[PDB]
């Protein structure tokens, strides 16, 4: 009933094996001339409502360096928004999708149209053909 048996050794030799690229986009948001949003690693004491994941892979500058490994529920970007009135900072992180895993490949950092810091993260991983996949002649 339109289901097909594929040689396992063909897979092991890399048959139909494929790459996979995912990009995450974020930027600083200016909530005021004196009030803006910053990229950085938050501290539990100085911030509230932190994500259940872990931030350890974050750098001191608020980003994650390429060539490191990531996984689901892993905070790849640390952004903190000032709380409108210490302990006046709230998270604005960009956790990786809980159902995806890969290796951080290339981080792009620049300024948006408005001069605010502008970031992009591209994770990559390989998708091994397996049971349940789809193929068609």
């Amino acid at each position: 009933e339109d289901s097909m048996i594929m040689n396992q050794s063909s897979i092991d030799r890399g048959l139909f094996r494929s790459l996979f690229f995912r990009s995450y986009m974020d930027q600083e948001k200016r909530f005021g001339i004196s009030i803006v949003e910053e990229f950085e690693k938050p501290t539990r004491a100085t911030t509230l409502r932190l994500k259940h994941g872990t931030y350890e892979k974050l750098d001191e500058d608020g980003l994650i360096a390429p060539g490191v490994r990531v996984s689901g529920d892993d905070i790849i970007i640390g952004k903190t928004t000032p709380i409108p009135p210490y302990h006046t900072k709230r998270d604005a992180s960009t956790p990786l999708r809980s159902t995806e895993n890969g290796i951080v490949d290339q981080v792009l950092l620049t300024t948006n149209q408005e001069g605010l810091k502008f970031v992009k993260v591209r994770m990559r991983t390989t998708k091994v053909p397996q049971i349940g996949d789809k193929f068609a002649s």
Partner: protein, 47 residues
């Protein structure tokens, strides 16, 4: 246990000689994700 989130290797078992990082350390059984595949595995604190 303040010894979490530090890279750890394995010495005995089926995954001997593989790198990894502790994820959960409830006690007596560490779940360290493997860097080579996209999987996590448990292993006691002795290995």
């Amino acid at each position: 246990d303040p010894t979490l989130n530090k890279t750890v290797k394995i010495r005995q078992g089926g995954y001997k000689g593989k790198i990894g990082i502790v994820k959960e350390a409830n006690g007596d059984r560490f779940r360290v994700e493997l860097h080579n595949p996209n999987k996590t595995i448990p292993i006691p604190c002795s290995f």
